[PDB]
Amino acid sequence: DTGCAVSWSGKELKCGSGIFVIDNVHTWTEQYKFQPESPARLASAILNAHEDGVCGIRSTTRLENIMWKQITNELNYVLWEGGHDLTVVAGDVKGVLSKGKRALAPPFLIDGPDTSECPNERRAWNFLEVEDYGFGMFTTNIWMKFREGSSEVCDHRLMSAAIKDQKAVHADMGYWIESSKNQTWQIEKASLIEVKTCLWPKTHTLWSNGVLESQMLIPKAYAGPFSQHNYRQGYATQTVGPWHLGKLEIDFGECPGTTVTIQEDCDHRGPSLRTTTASGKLVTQWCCRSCTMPPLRFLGEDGCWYGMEIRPLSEKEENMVKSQVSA
Amino acid sequence: DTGCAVSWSGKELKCGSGIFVIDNVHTWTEQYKFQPESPARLASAILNAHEDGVCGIRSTTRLENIMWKQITNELNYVLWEGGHDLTVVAGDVKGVLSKGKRALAPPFLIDGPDTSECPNERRAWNFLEVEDYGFGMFTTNIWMKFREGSSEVCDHRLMSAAIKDQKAVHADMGYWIESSKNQTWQIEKASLIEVKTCLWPKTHTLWSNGVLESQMLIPKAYAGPFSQHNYRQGYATQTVGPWHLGKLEIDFGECPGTTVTIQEDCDHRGPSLRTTTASGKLVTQWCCRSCTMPPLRFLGEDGCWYGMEIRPLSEKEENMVKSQVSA
Amino acid sequence: DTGCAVSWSGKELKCGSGIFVIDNVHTWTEQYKFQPESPARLASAILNAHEDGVCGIRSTTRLENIMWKQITNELNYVLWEGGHDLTVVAGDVKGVLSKGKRALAPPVNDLKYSWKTWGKAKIFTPEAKNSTFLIDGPDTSECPNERRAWNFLEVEDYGFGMFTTNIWMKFREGSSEVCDHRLMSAAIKDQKAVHADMGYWIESSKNQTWQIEKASLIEVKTCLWPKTHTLWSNGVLESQMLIPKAYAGPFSQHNYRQGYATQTVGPWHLGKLEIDFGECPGTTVTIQEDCDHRGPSLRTTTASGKLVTQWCCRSCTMPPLRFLGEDGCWYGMEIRPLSEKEENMVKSQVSA
Amino acid sequence: DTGCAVSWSGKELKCGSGIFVIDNVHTWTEQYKFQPESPARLASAILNAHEDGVCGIRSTTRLENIMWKQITNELNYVLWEGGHDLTVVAGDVKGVLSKGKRALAPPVNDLKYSWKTWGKAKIFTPEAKNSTFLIDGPDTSECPNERRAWNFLEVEDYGFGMFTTNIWMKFREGSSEVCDHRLMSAAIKDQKAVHADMGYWIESSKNQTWQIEKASLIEVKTCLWPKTHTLWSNGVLESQMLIPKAYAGPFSQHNYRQGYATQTVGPWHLGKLEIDFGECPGTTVTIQEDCDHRGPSLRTTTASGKLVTQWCCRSCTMPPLRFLGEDGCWYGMEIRPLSEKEENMVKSQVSA
Amino acid sequence: DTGCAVSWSGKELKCGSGIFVIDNVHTWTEQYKFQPESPARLASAILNAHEDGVCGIRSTTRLENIMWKQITNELNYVLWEGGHDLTVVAGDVKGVLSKGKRALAPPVNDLKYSWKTWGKAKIFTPEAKNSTFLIDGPDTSECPNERRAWNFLEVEDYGFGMFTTNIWMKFREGSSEVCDHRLMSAAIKDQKAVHADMGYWIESSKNQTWQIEKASLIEVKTCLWPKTHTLWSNGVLESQMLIPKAYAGPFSQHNYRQGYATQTVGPWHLGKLEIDFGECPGTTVTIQEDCDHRGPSLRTTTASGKLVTQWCCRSCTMPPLRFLGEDGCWYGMEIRPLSEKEENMVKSQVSA
Amino acid sequence: DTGCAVSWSGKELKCGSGIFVIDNVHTWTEQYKFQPESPARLASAILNAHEDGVCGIRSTTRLENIMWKQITNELNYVLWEGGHDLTVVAGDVKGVLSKGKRALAPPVSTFLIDGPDTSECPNERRAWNFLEVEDYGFGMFTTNIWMKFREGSSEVCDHRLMSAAIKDQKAVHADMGYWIESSKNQTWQIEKASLIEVKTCLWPKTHTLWSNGVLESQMLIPKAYAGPFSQHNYRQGYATQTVGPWHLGKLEIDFGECPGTTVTIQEDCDHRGPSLRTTTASGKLVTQWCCRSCTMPPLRFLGEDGCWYGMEIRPLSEKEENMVKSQVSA
């Protein structure tokens, strides 16, 4: 990568050759697009998979559900060409991109809700692999292929990680986790356009030694890096965080029109709650036992949430908005 | 770091925001210049250390030596204005940058050849740290300051690391260690302008878990990353390599006129040997027990060196140039 | 601003930090995009304005009309799903951006809507309810400018990117007639000045005297240029500004040309304009003391289509003031026709 | 100025053509070089001035003093080659760049010389004495400032390059107290303004109000800032400008800070300065009504070497105004010491 | 052209002022875009030409075909609103851009209209009435090339921008068979030469001799390369230019190769080409004295898919000349096959 | 080359790959440095040249004189170790770079390197144009060029250091010491020229634009002074300037009026003749000149010692006997 870039402070301009890790969540251009292996090959894979007894697939990335929705009509036309008694529908997914326990062997509900006629316990998932990139400036494709065997680790050809001076980052096409040092290394921001379930490979992780699986702010089950940069002092793993929203924004600030204070006689740690009631009233009193300020805050689409270690003070959690993931 | 950069393939020009890790071991111009604090503090500290029982300092990087040789005259002038009987001699660096055992506290031969009159056990080392960065495009300055404590770890504000697709790198002002994926994550090349002895911080290290201190080609003693990218198949730690040459260019290949054949029977592991004898005869046949081709190849001021596994089968060790470092 | 540039003469390349004032009229890229607050806030504000008696909205910038046009459908959908009797109609801007006399107050106790962003699956509400909130359009009598809202938005931050960048707007806390200062700029260096804006680009230079030389106007505003963004704004007479103060002209002495006065009755009814000093194709102007006084601006092509060749001014300076538009070529108030019977020529529609 | 730049937030990359005002105090490269008229013309002008009664020259900028300390040997050689008694002496700048009251006129009857460029390793003509021409130097009585030449050079054109660039000078056609406008700049955009020249950098910003925030001065001048290069020049009161009008301070309302008045007795004798708002290391300032009136600026350390810890202000606004000089840290004219006593401290060496 | 560039070896960086000849064939994204004069003028010219016998237009470059195809709608709008019946159809280009014998003359009068730009006031214009003005298209017989316009436009000036720039075209005053010099380039430095164009990129180099090394054509013109833009244009024989003069080949000694002559019967019917010296995949070429005479170029693969492997040349110098078209890999006129015979293989459509 | 550049009008910023011809007279950096082969080969070559008659050498470019000055000291402390009685004497360049009729050969009572015109070692026994480039250094803040011996005699300048480019309506013929600019204003003709030195070799025709149909009596810069053999080297109304102020060295050819002087077009004037200066020997300015069939603005030569006119512009209100003329071979 040969080019120039101004520093974060904006007082120097440096040119040379190296590795340039670019934010792909804020693309500055058109979003990437996946390309299938072959039109007929995917049809044969679907045929022999449904012969093997699978009722569809689950998308691992939000850039693959788009491809499936694009090519479902052509695939169904190819199916009807051979007189096959099978139908494929490309649904939509909002929230966590749930994990399927099956795969797609090389040579039928796609995505959608938690249908009881096709449980996730036998639906294919995480069977693609990048093999080429291409060219272009305002638009670039991605050519995908099949995976040879079982793997629950996210594809590493779309990921990145870098550190320089006092600022690290763990980036892929749907995640952007930022870290910085102010007397200690801790996470400061995290922009999530999707919620995955595959594992972050340890070959693309900084500071991967001596990490407890309970200290990671982003849980290991939600493609959180196995790093000590994925850590905030005074908090624990947000297993029951508002991960059902889909798009999230992890920030350490204050939700508008609300105050948080530190009290020793506070409630314990449990499911996360929203700063608004079931009807639309605003709660303005919260407290934590041992948290550090500013408090953890998930800026969702429907409102503004807090972490698992923060509890309301002028409201009762019996009648509030509470996270729906393993409550 | 906002800017634009052309990709490795050269068919794509991508612009955006992120982190740009640039090669300083190979930059168009001298990009950085260490700048001291003041001629007063750096004279009172030197004097107080002199009555404290030290006889000099060892430089940690090859820019600190230039910094000392650029202000030794001002230090002498200030000290002589202070009315004392102390003289600082700003020497040079010969090969490896050995470490001292003392330090300078914030409120006299410097560098030079190893002299028993002023041993390393009575000498300071690694007492400076980065305070801020400067402005500019070609002649940026870096500001130094004293360390409150003591540490064997290198300064983390001068180091970097990045990974994208299948390409890793660990970089600082004098190191450029590249890695790549070809059926395995293993080292590809290295370019060492200097040879340090501090420890690479684990906050700037990719893939830091499950690492044994016997597989890293660059030893932990000589500031080699504690990473699994610092690895090559069939080799081990190069503790008796040509680290006395200073500048080095590690690469995998074959020097002209030579040939390596792998045979368990080959001589066991031993110190590295140059490809030319003292007279200048070109040895044209080597062997290794369990290495892997292409073989390890150190290139410096002496032309060609091989690793600790590539032994000569058509030559004896009676007249061979061997590594200066002893075990 | 950190970057590099090549000087006006083209023989130097300087890199550093400072302020870079870029021509946004000739953008080199795609235009900026105004992004409003939220479907719930705007719908509540419009509903409360209609309750108060506000009849409509007059746009302040040509970039705001596009935002209103793109959000009108979502506003109508929200106003219908809320169970209200109101429909929003967005027109088009033709000519001068007229000035309203009212404003929208910030909304309290906002309405209810699903998302926070703009753009989702919706339905087309029927054009009905017998109560319309007109946005822009022609000058009518059922909805006069005395009951229309004007200049009630302001920037709260900028976006990111190089080709397409978004600008996020909010509500003004008070009421003012001054243009928003977060979209304006001005610079001077050596012997060249500029007063920039999103739709204004006034150029000035020194040739034995500081005076205006060029002006590109892709819109005709009616707010006031803030004096914090004005160069050389002391001892300024309102009768000498080439661009009138009532059309967002800078209150500066760089907005001046020798021999000319304020162009109050110029061809401002066109919208887009290109002010420059030269000769229209096929015409000539001569200095004559017997020429009559100044009046409304006139076009060099009559209604039928013939060309007027001979012109003369009284005490103007050459080259003459010239306006370029889609209609044709115009002259300033001081240049008068000498050859074609001025009771036979097209004149400016601006009030005399 | 065609080029590319990134915004202050670093989130945008905007390319285009306009005016780029770059910092030259922190110039990222080598400084500009001033190139005079010619060895024959300067000698003629100096001889005519000496005949008229001008005893010396007082510089206006540091870049001109560097120019004068580079051509003295060639000027002396040219003077000696004509066969007349005069010796040119070049001094140094120590403090404020004072001002003279005479000037050098464009000389007719040019002297005799063959070369045009400067510098060919000439000989050192021995000082003839009995007649001297002093340039800069300490303030003496033999050649007082009332009989010195000042502000008689101006730019004619810039040079070329990226690192080393030359500026070509020429004699003025008259006498003026205003600084040369071809070395000055000013810009504003969004909520950031700046007034810049070759030795000044006055940055201003908006935070609930427009006021000065920083000022880097590597020289102290005495000419007047031209009002053609000044933003917001109306309604300016000379008693409210932070940087005084007598020290080339802009006649602008951006050159203003709330709670402070003009700093006429500030530490200008130092030369290089750094105006900032904050507390000097180890000191505290409290706003209490029982405080002394204004007075000369004082240093935080006594001449013995003791640091005064407590200071008090009457009606100013925090953070306090603070000057950064070569020797130490200074306060403004409103911050009075209550810990120590004024009479036992170092005050401003400038006259009241 | 002030800017910085990295040398050929990539180990350096140089900045300065001069002329930068940039490749417009492999340039990421399209960088230039033709702009016509006006809808009213073009329709008037079309009428005044159809009144004289002209029944179509042949394009000169492939950037003009795009302009014709994107502006052929407002022309029909003007013709339909004028009342006079005439329809314009814009086809595509096949192979070589053939040459016409007519030209559009500038209009004397004009047709009434209300716009000076393109992209407004169109419905469908649903009228043809068998009075067709055919722009480009296939080689028909109703309107032959002997009665069809060609090479009547020239560049007025260039536009502004970084990624896409507009080129403003205007009508020529007189007929000419030479290509427009204002869109061409040529540069030589050290041992590298190039003859650049909007669709041509011809490279030359020295390695013991000055001869062509690599050409890259995305179109095949028929005008003449001007000699003012040609390097080393003396002592040139028309029988030795590798690219023929009739195909806009430079009249230069850099357009030369040892052992080869003019390729008049080469594969010039493929449009895009890549002239190189080497072997098509899976073929061997040798030199034998008993080979037959010269002939048309032949593709390596028969229509059935038979890859001929044995080829020979009588006086050529290896590596052999080859063409890389869309269909397959070709050879030059001097390379005849030892296997098969020129009776059951595809020849070159170009013939006399 | 690969990079970005802003066009002449300043309205565009085009990036890509191609050939960038850069002005080397106005370098933006420090000038190139010639580097010889080795301190031993040159000594053998000069010794063998002095053996058979060659009494000296003449420089071809201004950059070769610098190299000879830098290397002569090492070349003279190598001539006494072998006992050979020969001491090389360096020198400076003033005026044109005169030609030589000999040439050193690759190696297997004084030597004069440049200087004034001395009958002790005439140009007919002086080597000239025997060095050529082998590779470059082309970058920032420093540049080096490595030279090597030339095989055969040649009167053509070394083509490695030359360039030429044309785009749109502007052409240029560049060099390490030449910068000739052409432009199209209703016709193609020369516009400017910045000769930091005057050479006497021939401009190669491989680096020349529009080389067909060229007359040797119309080239404004003569072909004997390394003028391009092109039709861009032409100005209407003027012929070849065989007798001009070439003895100055540095020149700047431009078209205009020298300060305080006026030139008109009348037919009652003297015919073509040597170029004259605008000031007399005493230093009195002349204000009236006239040309027979020239075109305006008039041809003007700018030197370090004054301002000159072309051969077709003669004075009228003064007598040429009191004027300083060009000191070249008429």
> What residues of chain D lie within 8 A of the CB of E17, using their CB?
160
Q: Tell me the HSE value of B162 on the side-chain side, using a 13 A CA sphere.
A: 23
C15 assigned to some structural domain: no
Residue E87 lies in a domain: yes
At B208, which amino acid appears? Answer: S
Torsion angle defined by CA atoms of residues E291, E296, E301 and E307, in that order, rounded to the nearest 10 degrees: 0
C-alpha to C-alpha distance for A301 and E271, rounded to whole angstroms: 54
- Residue C8: other Cβ atoms inside 10 A: 17
Token pair 């004072």 is found at D98
For residue D47, the distance in angstroms to the closest alpha carbon of chain A comes to: 48
Between chain A and chain D, the number of residue pairs with CB atoms below 8 A apart is 6
Other Cβ atoms closer than 10 A to C342: 14
Which residues of B have a CB under 8 Å from any CB of D? 2-4, 15, 17, 135-138
Same domain, B139 and B39: yes
F241 falls within a domain: no
For residue B144, how many other CB atoms are within 10 A of its CB? 19
Q: Is residue A91 part of a domain?
A: yes
- Look up residue A224 and give its amino acid: G
Contact F6 C6 (CB under 8 A): yes
Element (DSSP H or E) covering residue F76 = helix F62-76
- The strand pair at D13-22 and D2-6 is best described as antiparallel
Look at the block and give the residue holding tokens 């103060």: C245
Residues F56, F98 contacting (CB under 8 angstroms): no
From the list F172, F176, F237, F178, the residue with the least C-alpha distance to F210 is: F172
How much of chain C is helix, strand and coil, in % rounded to 5? 15, 30, 55
Is D7:C158 a contact under the CB 8 Å cutoff?
A: yes
Q: What's the Cα-to-Cα distance from E203 to each of E9, E39, E193, E216, F19, rounded to whole Å?
A: 17, 40, 6, 9, 11
Nearest-Cα residue of chain E relative to residue C12: E2
- Looking at beta carbons, which residues of chain D come within 8 Å of B136? 28-29
Chain C interface test: which of B29, B137, B139 (most C C-beta within 10 Å): B137
Both ends of chain E: CA-CA distance in Å? 45
β-partners of residue E216 are E201, E274
Burial class (CB in 10 A: 0-12, 13-18, 19+), A107: middle
**Which tokens in the block code for residue B71?**
């202000």
Shared domain check, E216 and E113: no
Domain endpoint, select from D148, D171, D194:
D171
- Distance (Å) from the alpha carbon of A233 to chain B's nearest alpha carbon: 17
Helix, strand counts (H, E) of chain D: 3, 19
Q: Which of C120, C141, C171 is the last residue of a domain?
A: C171
**E247 lies in the same domain as E319:** no
Closest Cβ–Cβ partner in F21, F167, F170 for E189? F21
Domain count, chain E: 3
* Both structure tokens of D262: 């003009």
Assess contact for C88 and C135: CB atoms under 8 A: yes
- Interchain proximity A28–C112, CB inside 8 Å: no
Amino acid at position C344, single letter: N
- Contact across the interface for C16 and D6, Cβ inside 8 Å: no
* Same-domain status, A49 and A101: yes
**First and final C-alpha spacing in chain B:** 45
Chains adjacent to F (≥3 CB pairs closer than 8 angstroms): B, C, D, E
A106 preceded by a cis bond (ω within 30 of 0): no
Nearest CA in chain E to B12: E28
- Distance in Å, alpha carbon of A4 to nearest chain E alpha carbon: 13
B272 Cβ neighbours under 8 A, 6+ residues apart: B238, B240, B241, B242, B298, B305, B306, B307, B308, B322, B323
Q: Nearest by CB to C162, from B15, B135, B137: name it.
A: B15
Residues E116 and E93 in one domain: yes
Which strand (E) or helix (H) includes residue C5?
strand C2-6
Q: Name, in order, each residue with C-beta under 8 angstroms of B262's C-beta and a sequence gap of 6 or more.
A: B287, B288, B289, B290, B291, B292, B293
Residues A47 and A121 in one domain: yes
Partners of E184 in the β-ladder? none
User: In 3D, which of F286, F267, F277, F287 has the Cα closest to residue F326?
Assistant: F277
Chain gaps in chain A, named by the residue before each (C–N > 2.5 Å): 107
What are B180's two structure tokens?
């790549």
Contact between residue F198 and residue F153 where contact means Cβ atoms under 8 Å apart: no
- Chains that contact D by 3+ CB pairs under 8 Å? A, B, C, E, F
Supply C228's token pair.
């914090």
- In chain C, which residues have their Cβ closer than 8 Å to the Cβ of E15? 13
DSSP B203: G
Please name the member of E15, E160, E162 whose beta carbon is closest to the beta carbon of D162.
E15
For residues E247 and E221, is the Cβ–Cβ distance under 8 A?
yes
Tokens of D85: 């008694």
Chain A interface residues (partner D, CB cutoff 8 A): 6, 8, 10
Could you tell me if E292 and E261 are in contact, meaning their C-beta atoms sit under 8 angstroms apart?
no
* Tokens representing residue F34 in the block: 């010639």
Residue type, B88: V
Length of chain E in terms of residues written: 352
Flag whether F154 is in a domain: no
| Residues in contact with F235: Cβ distance below 8 Å, sequence separation at least 6, in sequence order | F189, F190, F220, F255, F295, F299
In angstroms, the CA E4 to CA F29 distance is 13
CA distance A121 to D83: 108
User: In whole angstroms, what is the distance from residue A126 CA to residue A59 CA?
Assistant: 7
**Chain D residues with a Cβ under 8 Å from any Cβ in chain A:** 6, 8, 10
Range of the domain at C319: 280-352
Contact (CB, 8 A) for B140 and B27: no
Q: Answer whether E266's CB lies under 8 Å from E348's CB.
A: yes
Whose tokens are 């071991």? That residue is B25
φ/ψ (deg, to 5) at B265: -60, -20
- D285 and D167 within one domain: no
Residue C135 in 3-state DSSP?
Answer: strand
Give φ, ψ of C80 to 5 degrees.
Answer: -80, -45
Contacts of F1 in chain E (CB under 8 A): 5-8, 20
Pairwise CA distance, residues D38 & D102, whole Å: 21
Measuring CA to CA, which residue among F283, F290, F282 is closest to residue F266?
Answer: F290
Rg, Å, chain C Cα set:
23
**What residue in B sits closest to E12 (Cα-Cα)?**
B28
- D159–C11 C-beta distance less than 8 A: yes
Give contacts of E178 with chain F, Cβ < 8 Å: none
User: What does residue F168 show for φ and ψ, rounded to 5 degrees?
Assistant: 60, -100
Q: What 8-state DSSP symbol labels residue F125?
A: G
Using the beta-carbon criterion (under 8 Å), do A209 and B203 form an inter-chain contact?
no
Which H or E run contains C86?
A: none
Chain mean position to CA E334:
24
Q: E102, exposed or middle or buried, with CB in 10 Å at 0-12, 13-18, 19+?
A: buried
CB-count burial class (<10 Å; 0-12, 13-18, 19+) for D263: buried
Residues F292 and F229 in one domain: no
What chain A residue is nearest to B137 in terms of C-alpha separation? A13
Question: Quick one: which H or E segment has residue D182?
Answer: none
Is residue B83, in this structure, part of any structural domain at all?
yes
F263-300: b or e for each residue (b if 16 or more CB lie within 10 Å)?
Answer: beeeeebeeeebbbbbbeeeeeebeebbbbebeeebbb
Q: Looking at the structure, do residues F107 and F168 belong to the same domain, yes or no?
A: no
How far is the alpha carbon of E25 from chain B, nearest alpha carbon, in Å?
A: 14
CA distances from D240 to B141, D263, D293, D313, D319 (A): 38, 9, 17, 18, 18
With CB atoms and an 8 Å threshold, state whether B137 touches C15: yes
* 3-class state of residue B98 by DSSP: coil
Angle, CA E128 vertex, CA E125 and CA E129 arms, to 5°: 135
* Residues D259, D317 contacting (CB under 8 angstroms): yes
Structure tokens at E214: 């690599």
d(CA E297, CA B246) in angstroms, rounded, equals 61
Is the Cα torsion angle F157, F161, F166, F172 positive or negative in sign?
Answer: negative
> Is residue A73 exposed (0-12), middle (13-18) or buried (19+ Cβ within 10 Å)?
exposed
The tokens describing E74, both together, are 């407002």
Tell me the shortest Cα–Cα distance from E315 to chain C, in angstroms: 52
Closest residue to F304, CB basis, from D3, D15, D115: D115
With b for 16 or more beta-carbon neighbours within 10 A and e for fewer, the B42-52 pattern comes to bbbbbbebbee
The answer to the question of residue C147 being in a domain is yes
- Which chain C residue shows the shortest CA-CA distance from A282? C109
Q: Which chains contact B through at least 3 pairs of Cβ atoms less than 8 Å apart?
A: A, C, D, E, F
Instruction: Residue C12: list chain D partners with CB under 8 A.
Output: 158-162, 165
Are E186 and E140 members of one domain? no
From chain F, pick out residues whose CB is under 8 angstroms from the CB of C8: 10
Question: Which residues contact residue A143 at a Cβ distance below 8 angstroms, ignoring those fewer than 6 apart?
Answer: A35, A37, A130, A131, A132, A133, A134
Nearest Cα to Cα of residue A164 among B169, B186, B194: B169
Tokens representing residue D194 in the block: 């700046």
Across the interface, do D12 and C236 touch by the CB < 8 Å criterion? no
Partners of residue C305 in chain E, C-beta under 8 Å: 112
Q: Looking at the structure, do residues A69 and A162 belong to the same domain, yes or no?
A: no
F260, burial (CB in 10 Å: exposed 0-12, middle 13-18, buried 19+): exposed
Instruction: Report chain A's terminal Cα–Cα distance, integer Å.
Output: 46
Residue F200: closest CA among F103, F301, F129: F129
Question: Which residue(s) pair with B180 in the sheet?
Answer: B186
Which residues in chain F have their C atom more than 2.5 Å from the N of the next written residue, marking a break after them?
108
Q: CA dihedral defined by A153, A155, A159, A162, rounded to 10 degrees?
A: 40
Q: Which residue, of F149, F172, F187, is where some domain finishes?
A: F149
Within 8 A by CB and 6+ apart from F264, the residues are F289, F290, F291
Radius of gyration of chain B (CA): 22
Report how far residue B207's alpha carbon sits from residue B226's, in angstroms, rounded to the nearest whole number: 8
Identity of residue B238: Q
Q: Which residue is it, tokens 């071979």?
A: F329
Between CA F246 and CA C106 the distance in angstroms is: 80
* C-alpha atoms less than 13 angstroms from C-alpha of A104 in its C-beta half-sphere: 26
Q: Which of C145, C28, B251 is nearest to D3 (CA)?
A: C28
**Å resolution of this model?**
2.9
- What the block records as the tokens of C261 is 């006065």
Establish if F298 belongs to a structural domain: yes
Which chain C residues are within 8 Å of E118, Cβ to Cβ?
none
Strand partners, F254: F300
- ∠ Cα C295 C300 C301 (to 5°): 125
Chain E residues whose beta carbon lies within 8 Å of the beta carbon of residue F6: 1-3
Residue among C24, C91, C25, C29 at smallest CA distance from C56: C91
Spatial neighbors of C67 by CB under 8 A, at least 6 apart, are C33, C34, C35, C36, C169
DSSP codes, E143-171: S-GGGSEE--EEEEEE--BSS-EEEEEEE
Which residue is associated with the tokens 């090669």? B23
E96 contacts E220 by C-beta, under 8 angstroms:
yes
For B3, the 3-state DSSP assignment is strand
> Which DSSP symbol is given to E180?
-
Q: Which residue of C has its CA nearest to F23?
A: C11
Looking at beta carbons, which residues of chain B come within 8 Å of E12? 28
Helix (H, G, I), strand (E, B) or coil at F279: strand
Contact (CB, 8 A) for D45 and D106: yes
Q: How far apart are the CA of B2 and the nearest CA of chain D, in angstroms?
A: 6
Is beta strand E87-90 parallel, antiparallel or unpaired with respect to E132-135?
parallel
For chain E, strand residue ranges (E) read 2-6, 14-22, 32-35, 56-58, 87-90, 132-135, 149-150, 153-158, 165-171, 185-189, 192-196, 200-206, 210-217, 273-277, 284-287, 310-313, 321-324, 329-331, 335-337
Can you tell me whether residue B67 is helix, strand or coil?
Answer: helix
List chain C residues with CB under 8 Å of D17: 22-23, 26, 28
Helices (H) and strands (E) in chain E, counts: 3, 19
Helix, strand, coil abundance in chain D, percent, nearest 5: 15, 30, 55
| Chain E partners within 8 Å of C326 (Cβ) | 114-116
Contact C78, C111 (CB under 8 A): yes
Of D17, D112, D114, the CB nearest to F10: D17
Sort out which chain F residues have CB atoms less than 8 A from C10's CB and list them: 6, 8, 10
Contact C224, C245 (CB under 8 A): yes
Instruction: Judge residue F216's burial from the number of C-beta atoms within 10 Å of its C-beta, 0-12 exposed, 13-18 middle, 19 or more buried.
Output: exposed
Closest residue of E to D16, CA-based? E161
Please, is E129 exposed, middle or buried when counting C-beta atoms within 10 Å of its C-beta (0-12, 13-18, 19+)? exposed
Same domain for E251 and E306?
no
Phi then psi for D42, rounded to 5 degrees? -65, -40
- Nearest chain C residue (CA) to A299: C116
Burial (Cβ within 10 Å: 0-12, 13-18, ≥19) of residue C328 = middle
Interface test with E, best of C6, C9, C22, C273 (most E CBs within 10 A): C6
Residues 6 or more apart whose Cβ sits within 8 Å of residue A80? none
Q: Which two tokens stand for residue D349?
A: 């060496």
Residues of A in contact with B133 (CB under 8 A): 7, 9, 11-12
Contact between chains at E162 and D15 (C-beta distance less than 8 A): yes
